Amino acid sequence: SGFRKMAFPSGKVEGCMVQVTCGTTTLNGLWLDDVVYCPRHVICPNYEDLLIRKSNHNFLVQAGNVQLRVIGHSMQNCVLKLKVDTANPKTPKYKFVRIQPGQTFSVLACYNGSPSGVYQCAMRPNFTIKGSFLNGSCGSVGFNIDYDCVSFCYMHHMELPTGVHAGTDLEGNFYGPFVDRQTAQAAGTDTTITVNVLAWLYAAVINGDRWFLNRFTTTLNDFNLVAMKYNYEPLTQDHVDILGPLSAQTGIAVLDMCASLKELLQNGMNGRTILGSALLEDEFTPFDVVRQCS
Amino acid sequence: SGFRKMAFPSGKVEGCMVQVTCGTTTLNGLWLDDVVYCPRHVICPNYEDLLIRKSNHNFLVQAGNVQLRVIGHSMQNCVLKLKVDTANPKTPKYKFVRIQPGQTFSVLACYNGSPSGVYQCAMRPNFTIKGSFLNGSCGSVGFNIDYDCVSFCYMHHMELPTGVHAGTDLEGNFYGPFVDRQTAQAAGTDTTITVNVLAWLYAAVINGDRWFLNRFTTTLNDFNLVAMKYNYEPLTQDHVDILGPLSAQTGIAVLDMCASLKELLQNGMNGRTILGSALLEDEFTPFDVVRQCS
Ligand SMILES: O=c1c(O)c(-c2cc(O)c(O)c(O)c2)oc2cc(O)cc(O)c12
Ligand SMILES: O=c1c(O)c(-c2cc(O)c(O)c(O)c2)oc2cc(O)cc(O)c12
């Protein structure tokens, strides 16, 4: 029993973190096979100009107590690729995967190439994440693990004025309309991930929280009319199919659960809690629930 | 910026998890040097009798794809110690430390010797933890990491009727008045960890949440009179010294912050949130705050 924000074990990613120093800038890098990936901001603006003025000996790469020799450098969008002469012997099976808003992943916060903490995050609908990063965390990566394969999905770059964070996939393509330089850019308006809230309500039922249930049901369209008023994402039919397995385990139809959520939005919780929370949590996917509530 | 429930990177602990099978029972074990630690329940009651009827070949220990040969067995309180012929080459620097109620630690949830997730926990004042464990998680360990040294503080054993969890330290001594057999035992009444709530309020101020602050101050004794009414632990003078460093960074006296907490307890939050939470969080220690809000 129990339900907690659970991150993937980080061992496979810890063995890939390195320190990249160029000039007076030091950040974190990701060492896979004979390539080190890090934010191109380390060379700091026309980055093509700045990179052409660099040489291999300008990049100091340290894997713990062993310095790696850079034999090549290249840029892929906002990510720098430093070729080294040594393939990382701890390289796990991995993939570069771009995730969707509403999906979750684990973050290994790192400083000077040294992991310090691990936690779960969701990609918000506005393509920011509500992370925990201090100065020197650039290059920390987000990831999921499927069996033995690490799917890298995020590299951290910057903090926005509202305190949320922005980054790229491992191909260097930013999530959202953000750029790796100082502008007036700010996060857009955010919405609540409706499908995740419903999954979380199912997790609550699996764990014995039932006070919010009711005998009512609603139509898909009548729920979305109420969800738009409370800044919730519209629920699609495809979201109902994904919530199908959770509906069968609990014997509660999705549209049955939607009626409870509509009641929770219109009335609040009245001093009660759900899974130890006094608000509606939207950072657990249906997969996260099944993984932890199976 | 940002504040999240952050666990320690689990790599150093993942390399110690093994699978222990005796009879038809299979659970998780902890392999350090040439010793495997696991709950004595694996031999299942007079455990001294059950253990005397066992032999080394009765214990199947598997470290991934390599079976470990048991050359000795011994019991230490509720923990079994299986001596193997191979010292774990991934053994980190480690210590066995018993923690105090109110302290936090990271849990590496494991199934069949394979890590599946990592999350933060606090030892509740009633010596239970609000974990996330499914069937087959016995032997999962809780730990802190200081620099390079892993302080193991918890081994999971059982779930109580209320859904909370109970276990021992790595010497096999239970936290709380619980025993490793089926009785009518239940968790006692719990209290809120007052010093941790105050630390969390400091983290909120460091992260820009200030709406709950006020110009009032209170005495230590007048705060405890209000804390006893809301099932909060009494605040001691020693708790004020520990909150000292957080008070200096924010320029807010501890007893100044106590007046805000008293107001929050008497009035609630009135629809507002603190660090993304609608209730008062008590599972962040002062050390956890300084570590993440430095
Ligand atoms: O991508 C960026 C980045 O990596 C860093 C950064 C700089 C350092 O000196 C570090 O030590 C560090 O960890 C990160 O700053 C930035 C500042 C911006 O305004 C915009 C950015 O895009 C980055
Ligand atoms: O300490 C205990 C324990 O380890 C297990 C357990 C049994 C299994 O068969 C497993 O596969 C497993 O992971 C754990 O059950 C218990 C059941 C009790 O009533 C009391 C206990 O103290 C334990």
UniProtKB/Swiss-Prot annotation, chains A, B:
According to UniProt, the reaction catalysed is: TSAVLQ-|-SGFRK-NH2 and SGVTFQ-|-GKFKK the two peptides corresponding to the two self-cleavage sites of the SARS 3C-like proteinase are the two most reactive peptide substrates. The enzyme exhibits a strong preference for substrates containing Gln at P1 position and Leu at P2 position
Question: Which positions are catalytic residues?
Answer: H41, C138
Query: Which consequence is recorded for altering N135A?
Result: Does not affect ability to cleave and inactivate human TRMT1
Provide the protein's localization.
Host cytoplasm; Host Golgi apparatus; Host nucleus
Per the database entry, which stretches of residues form a coiled coil?
A: none
Q: What does UniProt list under activity regulation? A: Inhibited by pyridone-containing alpha-ketoamides compounds 13a and 13b. In turn, alpha-ketoamide 13b (tert-butyl (1-((S)-1-(((S)-4-(benzylamino)-3,4-dioxo-1-((S)-2-oxopyrrolidin-3-yl)butan-2-yl)amino)-3-cyclopropyl-1-oxopropan-2-yl)-2-oxo-1,2-dihydropyridin-3-yl)carbamate) inhibits SARS-CoV-2 replication in human lung cells. Inhibited ex vivo by michael acceptor inhibitor N3. Inhibited ex vivo by compound 11a and 11b.
The residues joined by the cross-link Glycyl lysine isopeptide (Lys-Gly) (interchain with G-Cter in ubiquitin) are K5, K83
Report the residue ranges that make up the Peptidase C30 domain in this protein: 1-294
| Topological domain spans for side Cytoplasmic | 1-294
**Phenotype when changing Q182A:** Does not affect ability to cleave and inactivate human TRMT1
Q: Outline what the protein does.
A: Cleaves the C-terminus of replicase polyprotein at 11 sites. Recognizes substrates containing the core sequence [ILMVF]-Q-|-[SGACN]. Cleaves and inactivates human TRMT1, preventing tRNA guanine(26)-dimethylation of tRNAs. May cleave human NLRP1 in lung epithelial cells, thereby activating the NLRP1 inflammasome pathway. May cleave human GSDMD, triggering alternative GSDME-mediated epithelial cell death upon activation of the NLRP1 inflammasome, which may enhance the release interleukins 1B, 6, 16 and 18. Also able to bind an ADP-ribose-1''-phosphate (ADRP).
Assembly mode: 3CL-PRO exists as monomer and homodimer. Only the homodimer shows catalytic activity. Interacts with host FBXO22; this interaction promotes the proteasomal degradation of nsp5.
Q: Could you tell me what this protein is called? A: 3C-like proteinase nsp5
Organism source for this protein?
Severe acute respiratory syndrome coronavirus 2
